[PDB]
Design a binder for this molecule. Structure first.
Ligand SMILES: O=C1Cc2cc(Nc3ncncc3Cl)ccc2N1
Ligand SMILES: O=C1Cc2cc(Nc3ncncc3Cl)ccc2N1
Ligand SMILES: [Cl-]
Ligand SMILES: [Cl-]
Lengths: 4, 124, 124, 4
């Protein structure tokens, strides 16, 4: 999971 | 927004759509190419091809279970492009590049047409 | 093999599937949650959820146009997860995390359950 | 395009  | 994003989600979705295609699950159309038949999901074809997008948004054609391609289309070129739609992988070779590019132009798959043009230009 | 790969293909396919969902094109099922209705594509639901995979591979249920979820399922949690399926983006907030995790457990969306568990553990 |  990432900060888009 | 303040959303988080799962990097591998799109690839995992496409992998699962290809597994459904392999097992012939929920396929809703047959594409006929020079008497070679290919089963697929209309939505995946529309998501990948300007031609299929135009075909399945047509009020009469959206309801067809069989689509016949132009007789000039090569079944191997179509097969390579169908595999690309469901995998992101393109089996581009010296022996098939001309058929693949011609099929991608007809199907309106602009990124494929672009890499074929570049690979042809490098060989001249 | 000796394939080339188009990096953005899977993301572009998912973006186009979400555009078809937005325009209600080729959606083939309604998911009913506490009298809130959500139109979707069966194949995308199957590709994202262990529950929908099991439902639409069942010989009788594969043919249903309406699926009713368990009354304990929260429509907002479902809506957030449906958006995630079609975009890879999860709108996870303090006010919805419990409903989102409960819905993801029911839908069998293991990666979502994993990030919810981690976000909850960080707040304790 | 890349070599996967
Ligand atoms: O090269 C290409 C690839 C491609 C895909 C599509 N598909 C869609 N476009 C927009 N909204 C939904 C869909 Cl399904 C249309 C044109 C082209 N041209
Ligand atoms: O967490 C998850 C996400 C998920 C998706 C599916 N889908 C499929 N699996 C295998 N072949 C085809 C499909 Cl469509 C099954 C289980 C789970 N569990
Ligand atoms: Cl393309
Ligand atoms: Cl997930």
């Amino acid at each position: 999971w990432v900060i888009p | 927004d303040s959303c988080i994003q799962f990097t591998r989600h799109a690839s995992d979705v496409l992998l699962n759509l290809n597994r459904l295609r392999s097992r012939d699950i929920l396929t809703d159309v047959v594409i006929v190419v020079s008497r070679e038949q290919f089963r697929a999901h209309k939505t995946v074809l529309m998501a990948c091809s300007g031609l299929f997008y135009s075909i399945f948004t047509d009020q009469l054609k959206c309801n067809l279970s069989v689509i016949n391609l132009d007789p000039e289309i090569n079944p191997e070129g179509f097969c390579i492009l169908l595999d690309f739609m469901y995998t992101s992988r393109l089996n581009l070779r010296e022996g098939n590049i001309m058929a693949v590019m011609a099929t991608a132009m007809y199907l309106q798959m602009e990124h494929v047409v672009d890499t074929c043009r570049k690979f042809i230009k490098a060989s001249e």
